[PDB]
Swiss-Prot record:
This is Complement factor H. It is found in: Secreted. Changing residue 44 to L: In CFHD; with membranoproliferative glomerulonephritis. It comes from the Eukaryota. The lineage of its organism: Eukaryota, Metazoa, Chordata, Craniata, Vertebrata. Residues 1-60, 61-123 form the Sushi domain. The chain holds residues 84 to 206 of 1231 of the full protein. It is linked to Basal laminar drusen: Drusen are extracellular deposits that accumulate below the retinal pigment epithelium on Bruch membrane. Basal laminar drusen refers to an early adult-onset drusen phenotype that shows a pattern of uniform small, slightly raised yellow subretinal nodules randomly scattered in the macula. In later stages, these drusen often become more numerous, with clustered groups of drusen scattered throughout the retina. In time these small basal laminar drusen may expand and ultimately lead to a serous pigment epithelial detachment of the macula that may result in vision loss. Expressed in the retinal pigment epithelium (at protein level). CFH is one of the most abundant complement components in blood where the liver is the major source of CFH protein in vivo. in addition, CFH is secreted by additional cell types including monocytes, fibroblasts, or endothelial cells. Sushi 1-3 domain represents the minimal unit capable of cofactor activity. The property to discriminate self surfaces from non-self surfaces depends on the C-terminal region made of Sushis 19-20.
Length: 123
């Protein structure tokens, strides 16, 4: 009777209350592995007027732009002209002339919005 709130490519949505698009049901959106919700609103509630809220914002998980190790640099500097570090992206690093990497050379962006590998050193 409400219809269908919408569905997000970024994530998923679930229906709480009636498990359908009936009156009184809350379409609670939930992001997927690699996405996070943006904003406080995560749900749409079907009132007699229809769905109250709109489709919430689900943004892709971005991991903060790593600078570089001390005696090294980033390998994954290019990929896009936009280049945000989204989930799935592996930031690989390379050490300069005469330096060897202390940790591992690659770091992935996980759903946590945090880097999976630690920033390695070049010593």
């Amino acid at each position: 009777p409400c219809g269908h709130p919408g569905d997000t490519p970024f994530g998923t949505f679930t229906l709480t209350g009636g498990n359908v698009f009936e009156y009184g049901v809350k379409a609670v959106y939930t992001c997927n592995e690699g996405y996070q919700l943006l904003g406080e609103i995560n749900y749409r509630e079907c009132d007699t007027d229809g769905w109250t809220n709109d489709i919430p914002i689900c943004e892709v998980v971005k991991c903060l732009p790593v600078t570089a190790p001390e005696n090294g640099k980033i390998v994954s500097s290019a990929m896009e002209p936009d280049r945000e570090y989204h989930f799935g992206q592996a930031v690989r690093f390379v050490c300069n002339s005469g330096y060897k990497i202390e940790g591992d050379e690659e770091m992935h962006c996980s759903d946590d919005g945090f880097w999976s590998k630690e920033k390695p050193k070049c010593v």
